[PDB]
Design a protein around this ligand. Structure first.
Ligand SMILES: Nc1ncnc2c1ncn2[C@@H]1O[C@H](COP(=O)(O)O)[C@@H](O)[C@H]1OP(=O)(O)O
Length: 135
């Protein structure tokens, strides 16, 4: 779930592209403070928003995480990424959650959609809206 002030693409960016700190515990505070809960697992791709938008231009493929969807796209090239895993769940005081960080080089599959007409910038008619998988 995402806060109301973000479009799916802006949330995708906040969750999977803008790692505000190379450390998972700090980077996750942003997502957690927005979601009002400590996300158990989250991947940050060490790539640019424009790069992912271009991956959206790759051939459509079935989303492995939602088999009924055909709006996914495979990166075709591996990218460095950091996977954050919750090590200290704290349902009562989320600013207290701690995470581990796991660096890797893998492909990514992103679900893409037409932009939010009213709130997304016209610059990108097609945008990533979900990180379906890293393989
Ligand atoms: N409405 C949706 N349609 C397709 N994939 C979704 C949707 N909501 C979440 N996902 C993706 O399904 C997986 C599980 O989502 P969740 O943990 O929120 O239930 C994640 O890859 C997530 O990507 P993302 O985290 O980029 O939204």
């Amino acid at each position: 779930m995402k806060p109301p002030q973000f479009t799916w693409a802006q949330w995708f960016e906040t969750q999977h592209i803008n790692m505000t700190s190379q450390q998972c515990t700090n980077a996750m505070q942003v997502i957690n403070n927005y979601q009002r809960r400590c996300k158990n697992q989250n991947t940050f791709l060490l790539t640019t928003f424009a790069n992912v938008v271009n991956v959206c231009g790759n051939p459509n493929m079935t989303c492995p995480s939602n088999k009924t969807r055909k709006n996914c796209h495979h990166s075709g090239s591996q990218v460095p990424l950091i996977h954050c895993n919750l090590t200290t769940p704290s349902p009562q005081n989320i600013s207290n959650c701690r995470y581990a960080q796991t660096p890797a080089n893998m492909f990514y599959i992103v679900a893409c959609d037409n932009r939010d007409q009213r709130r997304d910038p016209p610059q990108y008619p097609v945008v990533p809206v979900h990180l379906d998988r890293i393989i």
